[PDB]
Amino acid sequence: TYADDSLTLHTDMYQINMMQTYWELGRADLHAVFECYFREMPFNHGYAIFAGLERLVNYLENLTFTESDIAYLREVEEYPEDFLTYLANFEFKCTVRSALEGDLVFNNEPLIQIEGPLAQCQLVETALLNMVNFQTLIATKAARIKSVIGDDPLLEFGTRRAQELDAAIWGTRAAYIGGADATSNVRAGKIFGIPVSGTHAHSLVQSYGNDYEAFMAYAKTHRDCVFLVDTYDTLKAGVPSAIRVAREMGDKINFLGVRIDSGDMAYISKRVREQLDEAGFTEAKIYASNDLDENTILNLKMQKSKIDVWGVGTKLITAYDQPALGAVFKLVSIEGEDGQMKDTIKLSSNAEKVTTPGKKQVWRITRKSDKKSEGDYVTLWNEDPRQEEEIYMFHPVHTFINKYVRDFEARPVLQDIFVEGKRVYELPTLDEIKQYAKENLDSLHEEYKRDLNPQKYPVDLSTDCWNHKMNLLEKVRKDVKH
Amino acid sequence: TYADDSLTLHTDMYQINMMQTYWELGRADLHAVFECYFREMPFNHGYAIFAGLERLVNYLENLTFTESDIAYLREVEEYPEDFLTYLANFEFKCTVRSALEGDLVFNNEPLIQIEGPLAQCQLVETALLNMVNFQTLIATKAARIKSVIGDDPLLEFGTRRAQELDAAIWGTRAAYIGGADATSNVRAGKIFGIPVSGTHAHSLVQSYGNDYEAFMAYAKTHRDCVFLVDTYDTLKAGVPSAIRVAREMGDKINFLGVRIDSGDMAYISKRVREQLDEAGFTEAKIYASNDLDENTILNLKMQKSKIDVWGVGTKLITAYDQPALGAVFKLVSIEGEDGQMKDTIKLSSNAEKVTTPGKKQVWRITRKSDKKSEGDYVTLWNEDPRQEEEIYMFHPVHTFINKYVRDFEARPVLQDIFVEGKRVYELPTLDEIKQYAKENLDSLHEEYKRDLNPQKYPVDLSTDCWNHKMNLLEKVRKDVKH
Numbered sequence: 001t002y003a004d005d006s007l008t009l010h011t012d013m014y015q016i017n018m019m020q021t022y023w024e025l026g027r028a029d030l031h032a033v034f035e036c037y038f039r040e041m042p043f044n045h046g047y048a049i050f051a052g053l054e055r056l057v058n059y060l061e062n063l064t065f066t067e068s069d070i071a072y073l074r075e076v077e078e079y080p081e082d083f084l085t086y087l088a089n090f091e092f093k094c095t096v097r098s099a100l101e102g103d104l105v106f107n108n109e110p111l112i113q114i115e116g117p118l119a120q121c122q123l124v125e126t127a128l129l130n131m132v133n134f135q136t137l138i139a140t141k142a143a144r145i146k147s148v149i150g151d152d153p154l155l156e157f158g159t160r161r162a163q164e165l166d167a168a169i170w171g172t173r174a175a176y177i178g179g180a181d182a183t184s185n186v187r188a189g190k191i192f193g194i195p196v197s198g199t200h201a202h203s204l205v206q207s208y209g210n211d212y213e214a215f216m217a218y219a220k221t222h223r224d225c226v227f228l229v230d231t232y233d234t235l236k237a238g239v240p241s242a243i244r245v246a247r248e249m250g251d252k253i254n255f256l257g258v259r260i261d262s263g264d265m266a267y268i269s270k271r272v273r274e275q276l277d278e279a280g281f282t283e284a285k286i287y288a289s290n291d292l293d294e295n296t297i298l299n300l301k302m303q304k305s306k307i308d309v310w311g312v313g314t315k316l317i318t319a320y321d322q323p324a325l326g327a328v329f330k331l332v333s334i335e336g337e338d339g340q341m342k343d344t345i346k347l348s349s350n351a352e353k354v355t356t357p358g359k360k361q362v363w364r365i366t367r368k369s370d371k372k373s374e375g376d377y378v379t380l381w382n383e384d385p386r387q388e389e390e391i392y393m394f395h396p397v398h399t400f401i402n403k404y405v406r407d408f409e410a411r412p413v414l415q416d417i418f419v420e421g422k423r424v425y426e427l428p429t430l431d432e433i434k435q436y437a438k439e440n441l442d443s444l445h446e447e448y449k450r451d452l453n454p455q456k457y458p459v460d461l462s463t464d465c466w467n468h469k470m471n472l473l474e475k476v477r478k479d480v481k482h
Numbered sequence: 483t484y485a486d487d488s489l490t491l492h493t494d495m496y497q498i499n500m501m502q503t504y505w506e507l508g509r510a511d512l513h514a515v516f517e518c519y520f521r522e523m524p525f526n527h528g529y530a531i532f533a534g535l536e537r538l539v540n541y542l543e544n545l546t547f548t549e550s551d552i553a554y555l556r557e558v559e560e561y562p563e564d565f566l567t568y569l570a571n572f573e574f575k576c577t578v579r580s581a582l583e584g585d586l587v588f589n590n591e592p593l594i595q596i597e598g599p600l601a602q603c604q605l606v607e608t609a610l611l612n613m614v615n616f617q618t619l620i621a622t623k624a625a626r627i628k629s630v631i632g633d634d635p636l637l638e639f640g641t642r643r644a645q646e647l648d649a650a651i652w653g654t655r656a657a658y659i660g661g662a663d664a665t666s667n668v669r670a671g672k673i674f675g676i677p678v679s680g681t682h683a684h685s686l687v688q689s690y691g692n693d694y695e696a697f698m699a700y701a702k703t704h705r706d707c708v709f710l711v712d713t714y715d716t717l718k719a720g721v722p723s724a725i726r727v728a729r730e731m732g733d734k735i736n737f738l739g740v741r742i743d744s745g746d747m748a749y750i751s752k753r754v755r756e757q758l759d760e761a762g763f764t765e766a767k768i769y770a771s772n773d774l775d776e777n778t779i780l781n782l783k784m785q786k787s788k789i790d791v792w793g794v795g796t797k798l799i800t801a802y803d804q805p806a807l808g809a810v811f812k813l814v815s816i817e818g819e820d821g822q823m824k825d826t827i828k829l830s831s832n833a834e835k836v837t838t839p840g841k842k843q844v845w846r847i848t849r850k851s852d853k854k855s856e857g858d859y860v861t862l863w864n865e866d867p868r869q870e871e872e873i874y875m876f877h878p879v880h881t882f883i884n885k886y887v888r889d890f891e892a893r894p895v896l897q898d899i900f901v902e903g904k905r906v907y908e909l910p911t912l913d914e915i916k917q918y919a920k921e922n923l924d925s926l927h928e929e930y931k932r933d934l935n936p937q938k939y940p941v942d943l944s945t946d947c948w949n950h951k952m953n954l955l956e957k958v959r960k961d962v963k964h
């Protein structure tokens with residue numbers, strides 16, 4: 001009762017009830033456009049890193065209602081056989097346009113756009129949000145942390161702290177995309193090809209009862225040695241014992257260094273560095289793992305801590321300070337009775353809290369001469385900035401802040417992934433995604449990617465797109481006048 | 483590269499490297515006891531609700547290294563064939579004792595205990611933590627929220643906001659255990675048998691362009707009608723239109739009520755109640771869904787909001803204010819050279835931040851006469867309070883706070899689940915778990931389960947258990963004297 005063989009019902013019940021309402025009344029194949037976007041920059045970071053495309057692609061390619069799916073809906077929920085045969089025959093026939101994994105993405109712009117039969121668009125929203133919200137959030141958190149670390153290793157060590165198992169594997173993949181250098185999760189190494197990393201735990205040390213014997217046991221059985229030194233006493237017990245083992249084993253091991261999981265690291269690591277150096281191990285590194293995030297790491301570095309490798313657990317994999325992105329999936333255009341597409345709106349008070357209507361594209365604008373970031377320019381589908389000598393970029397709320405831009409490149413961010421349910425996009429390798437992310441981040445102007453108080457990245461609606469929104473808003477507010 | 487057919491490598495790499503170190507040196511089958519516990523009450527709640535046992539059981543029953551598992555370890559990580567054949571032949575042979583799902587659980591007491599070969603115990607820690615940390619956390623969050631709501635429905639609606647897909651399905655199951663009445667997640671209904679619930683979305687309304695036509699379309703195609711009224715204007719558009727549809731359809735539908743997803747609900751819901759009542763729909767309910775948690779819900783109720791049903795999204799399913807439980811899995815006893823078990827310790831400064839050593843049991847103490855909660859009493863394995871006329875319960879830090887207890891019942895909390903890898907525990911149905919949770923909560927003394935400033939539930943170490951800890955701590959601190 002019943003077999004977990006399918007993600008097709010990983011959705012909100014109200015989607016199936018709406019699909020029924022559409023289908024019974026002959027409106028399931030009305031033409032719709034839906035868009036996915038978030039409203040606020042996560043962590044107030046200067047940029048976000050998109051993740052979730054490979055996950056979504058696999059989901060959409062397997063989007064059929066299984067025998068057990070239908071049996072549940074028939075036997076428990078008592079849907080009629082007519083509707084059920086519609087669901088049995090269902091195959092995905094929407095166009096999907098998306099940012100690619102590793103793209104920089106920002107608030108108030110479409111990141112994924114689904115276009116096709118209303119009922120099919122409706123089915124996919126919940127699962128897409130579930131996967132994209134989380135994966136983008138962790139990729140951005142890892143970028144945030146990696147930015148503060150610099151070139152030194154960031155190791156994603158948070159599986160034990162993650163919000164169930166998918167979170168651990170797909171989160172760690174997203175972390176690698178966003179800036180982690182390795183994972184602890186062996187299975188994520190297996191299935192994604194992420195480099196895998198480890199040291200040892202206190203349990204090894206306690207199994208012997210002293211540091212020397214445990215470090216020796218590890219040295220006898222492994223080439224690459226990082227010794228965890230704080231089981232009993234970092235300075236008096238662990239570090240001297242690590243040094244003793246390193247001396248006795250010589251070049252038969254790599255003494256990569258020592259891990260410290262406790263204490264005030266801004267004092268502890270400084271004295272440990274001295275101990276290693278005075279013993280002649282001036283290349284042995286100090287690995288830290290306790291309570292790390294972009295804030296404590298930045299402080300530790302600025303205090304002149306001597307830490308070379310950062311194993312980050314809880315705060316990265318759960319995005320602990322803001323554990324949800326707040327992406328939403330909204331209907332922006334729908335086929336009217338006359339067969340023509342109509343811009344659709346929901347009212348709020350804050351006219352910026354209102355979803356911008358219309359089928360849109362996002363154009364990343366840069367200065368041709370030196371590739372300077374000029375911001376994103378969000379158009380209706382019928383505008384192509386590439387054919388315009390000059391564009392008018394204004395802030396959508398603060399419209400008195402504005403510039404005419406000439407001599408620019410405009411790159412369309414939403415790419416075809418499926419056309420009418422047919423995949424036209426070849427999935428990159430994970431390393432290619434990570435390289436793509438690095439290059440995109442490297443190209444972003446320093447002001448938008450700096451760690452402290454980044455400049456706000458413009459996301460501007462075209463004159464036409466903005467006028468369409470405000471005219472529709474005006475029209476509905478006046479319709480609600482009576 | 484390679485097939486995701488297995489959870490056996492869903493672990494930290496350092497576990498496999500330790501298993502190798504144990505195995506090569508003939509110590510893999512040393513006898514070990516490991517215990518899982520958390521240090522702080524999540525959300526500062528008065529109690530926690532344990533979840534994760536069914537999940538763990540399924541994991542442990544399938545704990546074999548697959549062909550693709552071994553191929554990864556051979557081809558990528560280059561482990562030796564000897565060790566690999568050990569892993570190929572691996573079968574789980576540990577005893578597992580656990581709290582049951584729906585048990586009340588507290589900080590600083592073992593909740594799961596694994597006993598058997600050191601190398602096997604080591605393998606399972608990471609996955610167990612991943613699943614139990616999250617599921618217990620969400621079950622407790624749901625209890626917390628449900629406590630503030632009272633008898634009215636709590637609906638878990640957060641799939642779209644969850645941290646990837648496992649989080650959504652297993653989180654929603656945990657929410658049902660802890661106090662939710664239904665889920666939106668259809669797949670969780672399918673595979674777990676949770677009651678499933680829904681209304682409709684704004685997209686239905688926008689597909690028509692007005693409330694009346696969309697509410698009518700929904701009424702023509704469904705018996706149970708909840709109309710979402712805030713697409714355009716709750717008071718002027720949606721609620722009058724819902725009322726019109728209700729009037730026109732009469733007893734051909736159930737007009738269950740109206741959903742409001744926006745506005746100040748403490749004003750909005752009061753006026754909506756008036757509108758429904760004045761129209762003669764004094765049984766139609768008001769459903770709220772926006773930005774809900776135990777805090778905003780409590781405030782809304784205390785402001786005399788007229789809300790009857792609570793659809794909770796982000797803050798429940800992600801445990802947003804504290805998205806990790808902080809459970810850890812620690813070696814407490816290990817076979818020594820002489821073949822006898824030895825209490826094992828790791829030093830910290832705070833002697834309460836030190837893991838209590840020894841194989842332990844947790845006894846829930848109640849007064850026989852009226853079943854009053856007296857707290858938990860954590861013993862070494864060789865003490866059975868049931869055979870003692872009187873027990874001495876003292877606070878482990880504040881030892882001057884203490885009582886002798888007579889005429890008590892002592893119930894052992896850790897139950898046999900696997901004996902030497904063999905399942906002796908029959909899995910309850912989800913409804914039986916939820917009933918068990920309800921009854922356990924109902925039996926907890928009011929002071930420990932009250933919403934505001936609950937009394938701290940005693941978790942006391944027996945005289946023997948406490949003396950063992952402090953003597954070992956003293957011994958190691960004096961060993962570190964030189």
Ligand SMILES: O=C(O)c1cccnc1
Binds near residue numbers: 158184259289
């Ligand atoms: O390899 C390690 O040191 C490690 C990995 C995950 C969690 N804690 C430690």
Ligand SMILES: O=C(O)c1cccnc1
Binds near residue numbers: 395456458460
């Ligand atoms: O902040 C913006 O959106 C902006 C800034 C400069 C010029 N145009 C728009």
Ligand SMILES: O=C(O)c1cccnc1
Binds near residue numbers: 013681
């Ligand atoms: O059924 C609903 O009303 C619902 C379910 C999940 C998320 N939002 C709304």
Ligand SMILES: O=C(O)c1cccnc1
Binds near residue numbers: 876883885
């Ligand atoms: O808080 C405690 O642990 C406690 C309270 C009363 C008596 N004994 C212990």
